[PDB]
Amino acid sequence: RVADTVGTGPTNSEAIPALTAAETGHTSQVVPGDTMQTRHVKNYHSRSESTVENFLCRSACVYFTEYKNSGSKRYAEWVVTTRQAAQLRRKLEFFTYIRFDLELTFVITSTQQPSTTQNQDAQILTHQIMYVPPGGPVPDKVDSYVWQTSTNPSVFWTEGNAPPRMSIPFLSIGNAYSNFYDGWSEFSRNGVYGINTLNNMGTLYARHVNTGSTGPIKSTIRIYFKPKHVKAWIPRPPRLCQYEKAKNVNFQPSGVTTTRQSITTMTN
Amino acid sequence: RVADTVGTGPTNSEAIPALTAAETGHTSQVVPGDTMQTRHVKNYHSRSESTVENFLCRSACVYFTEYKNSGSKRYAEWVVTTRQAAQLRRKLEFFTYIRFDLELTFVITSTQQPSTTQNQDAQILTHQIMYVPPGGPVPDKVDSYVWQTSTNPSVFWTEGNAPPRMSIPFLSIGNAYSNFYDGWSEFSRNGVYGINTLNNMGTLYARHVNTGSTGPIKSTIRIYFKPKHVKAWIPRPPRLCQYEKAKNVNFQPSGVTTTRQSITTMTN
Amino acid sequence: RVADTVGTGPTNSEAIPALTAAETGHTSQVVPGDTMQTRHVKNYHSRSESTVENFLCRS
Amino acid sequence: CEVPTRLNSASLKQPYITQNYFPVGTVVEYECRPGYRREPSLSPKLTCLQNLKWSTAVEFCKKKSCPNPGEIRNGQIDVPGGILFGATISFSCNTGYKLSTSSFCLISGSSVQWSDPLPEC
Amino acid sequence: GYSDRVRSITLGNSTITTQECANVVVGYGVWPDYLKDSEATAEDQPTQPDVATCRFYTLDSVQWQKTSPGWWWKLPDALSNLGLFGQNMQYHYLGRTGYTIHVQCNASKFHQGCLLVVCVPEAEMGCATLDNTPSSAELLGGDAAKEFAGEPIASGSNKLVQRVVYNAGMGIGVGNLTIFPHQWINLRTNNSATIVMPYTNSVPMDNMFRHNNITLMVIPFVPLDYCPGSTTYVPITVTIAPMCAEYNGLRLASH
Amino acid sequence: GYSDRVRSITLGNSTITTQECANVVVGYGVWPDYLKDSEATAEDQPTQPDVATCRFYTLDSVQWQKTSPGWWWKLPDALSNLGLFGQNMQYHYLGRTGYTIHVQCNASKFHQGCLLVVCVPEAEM
Amino acid sequence: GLPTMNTPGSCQFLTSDDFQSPSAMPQYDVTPEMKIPGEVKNLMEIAEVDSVVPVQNVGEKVNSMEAYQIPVRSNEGSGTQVFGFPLQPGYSSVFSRTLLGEILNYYTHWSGSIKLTFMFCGSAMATGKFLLAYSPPGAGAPTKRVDAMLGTHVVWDVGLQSSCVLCIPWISQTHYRYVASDEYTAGGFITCWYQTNIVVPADAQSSCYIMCFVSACNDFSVRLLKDTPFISQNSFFQ
Amino acid sequence: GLPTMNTPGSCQFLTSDDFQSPSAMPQYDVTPEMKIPGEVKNLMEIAEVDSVVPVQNVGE
Amino acid sequence: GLPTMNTPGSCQFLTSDDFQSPSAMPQYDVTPEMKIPGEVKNLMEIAEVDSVVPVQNVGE
Amino acid sequence: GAQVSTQKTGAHIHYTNINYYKDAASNSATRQDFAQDPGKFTEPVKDIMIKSLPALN
Amino acid sequence: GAQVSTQKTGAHIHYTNINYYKDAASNSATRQDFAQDPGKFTEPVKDIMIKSLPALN
Amino acid sequence: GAQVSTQKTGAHIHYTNINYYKDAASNSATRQDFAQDPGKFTEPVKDIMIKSLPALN
Numbered sequence A, B: 001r002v003a004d005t006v007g008t009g010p011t012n013s014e015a016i017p018a019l020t021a022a023e024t025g026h027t028s029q030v031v032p033g034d035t036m037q038t039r040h041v042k043n044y045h046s047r048s049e050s051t052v053e054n055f056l057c058r059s060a061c062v063y064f065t066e067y068k069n070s071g072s073k074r075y076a077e078w079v080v081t082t083r084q085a086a087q088l089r090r091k092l093e094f095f096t097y098i099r100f101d102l103e104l105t106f107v108i109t110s111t112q113q114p115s116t117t118q119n120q121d122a123q124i125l126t127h128q129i130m131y132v133p134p135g136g137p138v139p140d141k142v143d144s145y146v147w148q149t150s151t152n153p154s155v156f157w158t159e160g161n162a163p164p165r166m167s168i169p170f171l172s173i174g175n176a177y178s179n180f181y182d183g184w185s186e187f188s189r190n191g192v193y194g195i196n197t198l199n200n201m202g203t204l205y206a207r208h209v210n211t212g213s214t215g216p217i218k219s220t221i222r223i224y225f226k227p228k229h230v231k232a233w234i235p236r237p238p239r240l241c242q243y244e245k246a247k248n249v250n251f252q253p254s255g256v257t258t259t260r261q262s263i264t265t266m267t268n
Numbered sequence C: 001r002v003a004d005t006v007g008t009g010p011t012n013s014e015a016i017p018a019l020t021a022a023e024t025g026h027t028s029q030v031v032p033g034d035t036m037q038t039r040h041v042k043n044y045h046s047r048s049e050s051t052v053e054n055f056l057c058r059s
Numbered sequence D: 001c002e003v004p005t006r007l008n009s010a011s012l013k014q015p016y017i018t019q020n021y022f023p024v025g026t027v028v029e030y031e032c033r034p035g036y037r038r039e040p041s042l043s044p045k046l047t048c049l050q051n052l053k054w055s056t057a058v059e060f061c062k063k064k065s066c067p068n069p070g071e072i073r074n075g076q077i078d079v080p081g082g083i084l085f086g087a088t089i090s091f092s093c094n095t096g097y098k099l100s101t102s103s104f105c106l107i108s109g110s111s112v113q114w115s116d117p118l119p120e121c
Numbered sequence E: 001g002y003s004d005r006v007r008s009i010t011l012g013n014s015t016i017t018t019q020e021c022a023n024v025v026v027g028y029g030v031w032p033d034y035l036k037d038s039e040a041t042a043e044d045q046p047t048q049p050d051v052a053t054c055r056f057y058t059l060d061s062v063q064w065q066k067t068s069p070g071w072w073w074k075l076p077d078a079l080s081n082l083g084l085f086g087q088n089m090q091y092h093y094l095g096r097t098g099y100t101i102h103v104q105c106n107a108s109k110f111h112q113g114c115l116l117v118v119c120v121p122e123a124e125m126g127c128a129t130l131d132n133t134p135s136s137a138e139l140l141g142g143d144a145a146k147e148f149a150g151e152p153i154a155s156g157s158n159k160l161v162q163r164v165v166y167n168a169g170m171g172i173g174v175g176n177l178t179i180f181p182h183q184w185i186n187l188r189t190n191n192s193a194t195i196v197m198p199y200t201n202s203v204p205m206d207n208m209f210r211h212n213n214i215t216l217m218v219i220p221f222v223p224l225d226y227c228p229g230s231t232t233y234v235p236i237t238v239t240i241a242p243m244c245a246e247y248n249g250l251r252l253a254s255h
Numbered sequence F: 001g002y003s004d005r006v007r008s009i010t011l012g013n014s015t016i017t018t019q020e021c022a023n024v025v026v027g028y029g030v031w032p033d034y035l036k037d038s039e040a041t042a043e044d045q046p047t048q049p050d051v052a053t054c055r056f057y058t059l060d061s062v063q064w065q066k067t068s069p070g071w072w073w074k075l076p077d078a079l080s081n082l083g084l085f086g087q088n089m090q091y092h093y094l095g096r097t098g099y100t101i102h103v104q105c106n107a108s109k110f111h112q113g114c115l116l117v118v119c120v121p122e123a124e125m
Numbered sequence G: 001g002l003p004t005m006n007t008p009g010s011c012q013f014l015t016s017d018d019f020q021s022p023s024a025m026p027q028y029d030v031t032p033e034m035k036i037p038g039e040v041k042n043l044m045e046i047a048e049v050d051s052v053v054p055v056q057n058v059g060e061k062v063n064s065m066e067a068y069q070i071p072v073r074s075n076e077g078s079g080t081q082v083f084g085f086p087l088q089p090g091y092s093s094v095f096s097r098t099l100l101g102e103i104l105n106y107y108t109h110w111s112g113s114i115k116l117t118f119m120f121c122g123s124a125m126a127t128g129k130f131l132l133a134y135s136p137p138g139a140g141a142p143t144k145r146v147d148a149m150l151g152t153h154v155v156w157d158v159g160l161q162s163s164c165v166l167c168i169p170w171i172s173q174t175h176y177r178y179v180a181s182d183e184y185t186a187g188g189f190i191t192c193w194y195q196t197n198i199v200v201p202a203d204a205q206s207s208c209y210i211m212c213f214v215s216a217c218n219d220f221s222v223r224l225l226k227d228t229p230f231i232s233q234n235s236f237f238q
Numbered sequence H, I: 001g002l003p004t005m006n007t008p009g010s011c012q013f014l015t016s017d018d019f020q021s022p023s024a025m026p027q028y029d030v031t032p033e034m035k036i037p038g039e040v041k042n043l044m045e046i047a048e049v050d051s052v053v054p055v056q057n058v059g060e
Numbered sequence J, K, L: 001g002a003q004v005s006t007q008k009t010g011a012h013i014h015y016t017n018i019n020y021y022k023d024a025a026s027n028s029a030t031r032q033d034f035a036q037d038p039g040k041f042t043e044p045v046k047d048i049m050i051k052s053l054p055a056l057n
């Protein structure tokens, strides 16, 4: 529960609560009752929505891609990375090291494409989403033998049902995730530089298990990430500039804030 | 349980229960047994359906809007306000200040529009409803980046399933909702005047997540509000006139009641 | 739970843990602390995903 | 790369407007359309990245502010939408005086001015 | 009696004295220590020199001019070629240490200015060209200090680091950096600033040559100023002492 | 530890701080208080605002020149038009208050001078 | 067969929900946690640390460090104004990009006191006194020292301690104030004035700078998750 | 897998129903209640106060 | 009719799941187990036995 | 941790309730709060008024 | 083996929870951990600083 | 007749299980049998071999 105010009165002492030195870097712990007269009011407000969990514990779309039931692109692939979008990336970048379980949710939607084939009577489409850990046999084609998914995890969804959802544990060879890395892949300070060196989360694939209709159909899969059981360390300032790449922090220089008329202007 | 009647007899006393002065404004607490002879009958009737909750605790449509999968209007928006309809507004206006939790329910229905495109074989449509709190990035277009809904709440519904429903807590910076306001936005008694100044509930958006078919389709979303955990204060007279605007109480003058033949007429 | 390492020091004895005969077919049960100096670190790793069930229990 | 992203606040600078071939690593500059004023913090440049996609673009210009409306004698001015470019103020009169009715903030030359002058009432 | 403006620090065979100092900032409230048995992963025995490694090393000085943007130093890189510390981290594969940073500036009562002295963990930096990444020489300066730039670095086919002072090369806000353990040198109040940093990382030990854990940033927020007649050359000196340093995996020297 | 050259004063919603101050002179050794029941004469109940009236009001500044003789201020008159204090003493017939006076001058270590700051009761001229 | 009945809100995906779900990697052994310095448990912990306020954000000054310096110099006059801005941490451009402002822009309601710390960055031989005032709304910004003295003020005396803290309290009728711009939830005005005049000795610069830091108080609180307006994107990165 | 069976009246929206539903804003802190004069608990409380009767409702 | 609500991840086939399911052959009597030498309980048991290393894997 | 309460039956048989969510705004509606006090609207006067006595005496 | 805990209600009524899976990564989110310690970021200094005393004396 | 057992959590919170069918071949999988005995494959010899002693002496 937030701290209640304390009632005070006038004062003519040698105690100087307001005067301090910020050279030390110590934030002054003064309350309004130190520089004025205050009443005593109980405070019932609560910092329950400001906790790390409630802050990052929401579903956010991190990618979406489109695959068809005919033509060239018969299946879709994605290299797992949370830097593809801006909103969740910027929320995560508040901290240097974060440890969290992941609740993955998938939304799949199909659409009939313009063609000229007559007599179109489709059937229900079923989709398969296969995750390959790094070092696995990646599908080279849509009718690949790798789709057996013996050891590899897979999820099968029929259109018209509730969206698929699964829970993934804290996967990392380290003791926490790293949002930032200040190093090189090689010990000789050459090669890949940045958080890309640490990244190694494998690839995710998706396909139509059946053609369904004699006409063209394009499907689109959306990936949603909700962090849970979150633990975080070392906070850092929010990204002032706009993001440009997913593999690096490269940016274009921007001003600290937005300009007003003069130093005595009450309006923007 | 309602109060039972009490048996009485004849009386020739100086007690004058009937005679009173209404100048005080005190409502006379007389019962039939005071001005006549009565029997004693137990009353088993109950005022259980007259409680504030049972009165306002019912779903009521407060708005509905239409969006398409092609053309110009690709998404729909609504500024949250309970004054759009007449029935729930008039039920709520019985009280000056009300505090209540909200149970929101959404009904979405699609319809094929007249066209000339041949070979139409649609797929199942999925809808997204995104709520933006005031100060948020409002969608400017249907493929906007804001649809990520990281911090913002969102609901995804596939057609053919049960209608979506969620519970919203008592949202207000005050200690109760205000059905009526007698003031101005500015301290100088100028600018917006009325309950519009207090209103600030944000905007609600809705879109098709997929085109679904090569032919035109129009969807319509209906918003239903059921108040629960209701607490109310200061009752006021019901709206005699018909409503005209949603932002104000402006009305056209109307007579107190409906006219009969003479002051001794038993019929309407 | 996997076995934790044991801290050891220098040694000038007649014990020959490294020298063995594989002609018997007996796999040598030597640990790193036998051929070098080691620290004592508790090991919290677990062989829970290496059990026969977890291995073959997938569709 | 394709055509640079359209933005409401600014417009593509000459001669990029008359150009249809943009190799990778090509920078284009924008300019504030009327009235719109340039924002000093943001820089109006975009670069074609390797993915044949332009760099993130934000409104590099903001609407110009019309002067204060003034104070009409024996009259009330209603300002529902601020005094920015494209707003409309309303002129009314008190009970007991007879009164244009509205003025619009529009671009007139190099700056923005009100249209109708203040009436008399 | 005592004052609180005087402080002495003794490490190894070195000592540091101060007559005008603010308090001492201690990392995130944690004092550096060794690695515990219940949190280690490597199995061979570590080496702990504890005297030669744990001492004050004094890097070069930099002149503070009326128009200086600021300087930055990577601590694992700065002490890489200096003393036994460099020889230890050279032969070994893994290393773990905490760094205490003392930055000193000297002036009169007629000189004015203000420096922010901040320790940033994992200060990943950007490049002038959006495509491509910065070169090791531009990011790491050893035996010397790297300088920020007042105006934005031009983008071309180059591997130069974006050095804008207002974006601190990370694209963030220079004012918001205070979230990291920091201090100020206000030429009217304190001659020097001292920060004690523990070992922060996501793994227990790490190779000290391919990863730089923390970066020291000295940024003048108020420019140096004086009237004609007073001293025009005002230098800034930085002394770094490693603390509780241990190494693992002895191997052939790496150059 | 402490020094004695630093002093803060808090009244109402106002505060005054000082880094180089002498002691604080307290009238004739008496601290201001309210009127007692055994020493009052008027019979109706008094009003005591106690917050808005009891606060630091800052009059204008005066330049000290190499040839300035000095300045004087009548306190009941000086605050007559300033704040609620002025409105209170305006509507009311009788009033009773004690005044705390803080006079501040700022200079360097190369400036020299000396001011006498004195409160004269009943300064008939 | 246990007879059940399905209520509305079935087979729907509400992004802010809290349910259990089957694990995709069963019996996975996670790396044991280790002690890491500086653990954040609450966002308010981040909002209670100082952050330099870009007060002089005028013209091109935002493209340098000059946006952080408040230029106070000796003048032949008294009672002039140094700076002034409104109390709108979420909306005002002055506090929008400060740690407090960057945390507020993720929420919708805020409530508590504000601490402003002013540090003198002039010579050791300079002196001065300043009036730091806060005026609740109802009457406009005070135009002169006589009007600003009537509010909540502090008189700061520049000396050995170079930093003075002005604590803006909570004087709002509403329990929570809107982060966005709403004229109903007005905040007030914060201004600073020359109390006396800067006193500088010969051979000492007479033009100095002040710096300003802002931090949340112990009673601070925020109450509605939302999405920051600043973050943007035209297409998926890389 | 607990074997269940769905009865009629499933996936239907009856406006006068009483069920629980997931909160859209979890762990939201509401403004504490304050004493407000004139609280209505029952409609009958309103029906028991006098109201002037327009008896002569004839013509204009 | 017990009022229930279906969460996302319904009627989906996750290959690494752990649920009960009705037996197709009810009351089937399995052959009683017998002692068989060399039972494997953990894969690591197999990884801890020696295996000759093809070091000179050069050319043919 | 269940709640067992009486139902709404005619005059002249218990139900069981469990809360599944953790927000207290997701519970069912409070339909069984039968408490009245019409003395604030009827009879808001300062001096008590006995029924049998004359109002103004 | 159920857990009964208090819900999030306004100031100035219990809920029941059962775990069905055996992985501890499939449980719900921990939304009710209200514990703070801002002394690491505010006041990280070595020597304590009393509020009323001068900082540098 | 329910079974309450501990879950799989990280080092350095109980689950409930009920059987609905009557065949014992329809239960869930046994994922938590962590028992080893590599002495059959490693060291299958007849005479014990102490580590520090010479193998053939």
Ligand SMILES: CCCCCCCCCCCCCCCC(=O)O
Residues within 6 Å of the ligand: A080, A081, A082, A102, A104, A129, A130, A131, A153, A154, A155, A166, A168, A171, A177, A178, A179, A199, A201, A204, G024
């Ligand atoms: C049946 C489908 C299974 C899909 C499994 C997908 C697993 C994705 C794991 C992602 C973990 C989080 C990555 C964080 C990366 C980082 O910040 O370093």
Ligand SMILES: CCCCCCCCCCCCCCCC(=O)O
Residues within 6 Å of the ligand: B080, B081, B082, B102, B104, B129, B130, B131, B153, B154, B155, B166, B168, B171, B177, B178, B179, B199, B201, B204, H024
């Ligand atoms: C996933 C969709 C979420 C939608 C959230 C909608 C929230 C609407 C809140 C409305 C509260 C009641 C407003 C009453 C206004 C008044 O009477 O002053």
